[PDB]
RNA sequence: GGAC
């Protein structure tokens, strides 16, 4: 299963320090605008140590699901979340298309996940009924790891030993497909977030993805 | 400090 996950992982260094510093400033400006109430309601998802910023297409998850279950996550109504920022197209998405990571016109969803030290996201599969593959992630502000096949326990939070631990370094691009994207959860453990880390996740929603 |  660890070997199976490996076949679906593409990881490469793509962004330089100056490019990360420019984007990390754009991330800091996204956080500032969200704190000023200048984004649409569903653009900003707030949790104690993690903030999610949905552009282009957002999704419901977790406790926002009244009926929890496989296939229950939903996209928001059309045109609800804010459009992908121009700086995301030029700085992040044009670099990925020019380096053949994804086709042009693939990405219609750009989500920025912002983690404070000790933050996490519990094990999950990116909803197969919502998102097409592959899943592209670009990390910022610090180095961390992406873990697979972890079982979470709570009160207090405990995370089982990962099937695979993948270091995700600042400026590196992580791509998930196949088994690593479909047949096993991925997560972030609190111990792996030692400083603030942000990741811009570029995805393609399916033509049949249900909306709220 | 909680997406399976
Ligand atoms: Mn995910």
């Amino acid at each position: 299963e660890a070997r199976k996950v490996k076949s679906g992982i593409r990881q490469m260094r793509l962004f330089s320090q100056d490019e990360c510093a420019k984007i990390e400033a754009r991330i800091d400006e996204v956080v500032s605008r969200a704190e000023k109430g200048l984004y649409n309601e569903h653009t900003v998802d707030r949790a104690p140590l993690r903030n999610k910023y949905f552009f282009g297409e957002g999704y419901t998850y977790g406790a926002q699901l009244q009926k929890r279950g496989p296939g229950q996550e939903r996209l928001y109504p059309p045109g609800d979340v804010d459009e992908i920022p121009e700086w995301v197209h030029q700085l992040v998405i044009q670099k990925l298309v020019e380096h053949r990571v994804i086709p042009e016109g693939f990405v219609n969803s750009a989500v920025i996940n912002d983690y404070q030290p000790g933050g996490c996201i519990v094990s999950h599969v990116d909803p197969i009924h919502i998102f097409e593959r592959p899943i592209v992630s670009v990390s910022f502000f610090s180095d961390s790891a992406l873990c697979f096949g972890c079982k979470f326990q709570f009160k207090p939070i405990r995370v089982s030993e990962p099937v695979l631990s993948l270091p995700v370094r600042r400026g590196s691009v992580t791509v998930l497909s196949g088994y690593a994207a479909d047949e096993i959860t991925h997560c972030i453990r609190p111990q792996d977030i030692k400083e603030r880390r942000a990741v811009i996740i570029l995805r393609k929603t399916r033509l049949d993805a249900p909306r709220l």
Side-chain angles (χ1 to χ4, degrees), chain A residues 168-188:
Chain A
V168 281
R169 301 262 165 174
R170 177 190 174 205
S172 294
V173 175
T174 305
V175 182
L176 303 186
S177 71
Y179 191 98
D182 300 357
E183 303 171 53
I184 185 175
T185 64
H186 61 270
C187 74
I188 294 185

Side-chain angles (χ1 to χ4, degrees), chain A residues 106-150 152-206:
Chain A
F106 173 86
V107 176
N108 72 320
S109 171
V111 176
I112 302 181
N113 291 4
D114 199 17
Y115 291 87
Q116 302 302 328
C120 73
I121 187 154
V122 338
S123 307
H124 62 274
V125 181
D126 282 11
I128 64 98
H129 77 281
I130 295 296
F131 288 111
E132 213 74 68
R133 273 55 173 158
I135 305 157
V136 183
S137 91
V138 194
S139 299
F140 297 96
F141 290 99
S142 77
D143 299 342
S144 190
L146 187 74
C147 293
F148 296 87
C150 284
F152 265 72
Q153 281 172 357
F154 313 93
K155 295 168 179 160
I157 289 172
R158 297 279 141 82
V159 187
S160 60
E161 287 299 288
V163 175
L164 187 76
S165 170
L166 177 69
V168 281
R169 301 262 165 174
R170 177 190 174 205
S172 294
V173 175
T174 305
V175 182
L176 303 186
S177 71
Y179 191 98
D182 300 357
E183 303 171 53
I184 185 175
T185 64
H186 61 270
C187 74
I188 294 185
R189 307 188 299 176
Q191 54 269 56
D192 296 325
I193 301 292
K194 304 175 184 175
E195 292 177 358
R196 178 198 177 185
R197 178 243 192 200
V199 57
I200 307 177
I201 311 180
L202 304 310
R203 285 174 287 212
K204 169 173 184 168
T205 61
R206 299 163 58 106

Side-chain angles (χ1 to χ4, degrees), chain A residues 26 30-31 33-34 39-40 42-44 52-59 81-85 87-88 107-112 200-203:
Chain A
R26 302 306 195 278
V30 169
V31 181
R33 190 180 164 181
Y39 279 135
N40 297 351
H42 290 153
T43 301
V44 185
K52 291 186 168 182
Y53 305 90
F54 308 115
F55 296 104
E57 295 295 345
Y59 56 84
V81 296
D82 284 286
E83 61 184 21
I84 298 175
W87 67 263
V88 180
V107 176
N108 72 320
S109 171
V111 176
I112 302 181
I200 307 177
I201 311 180
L202 304 310
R203 285 174 287 212

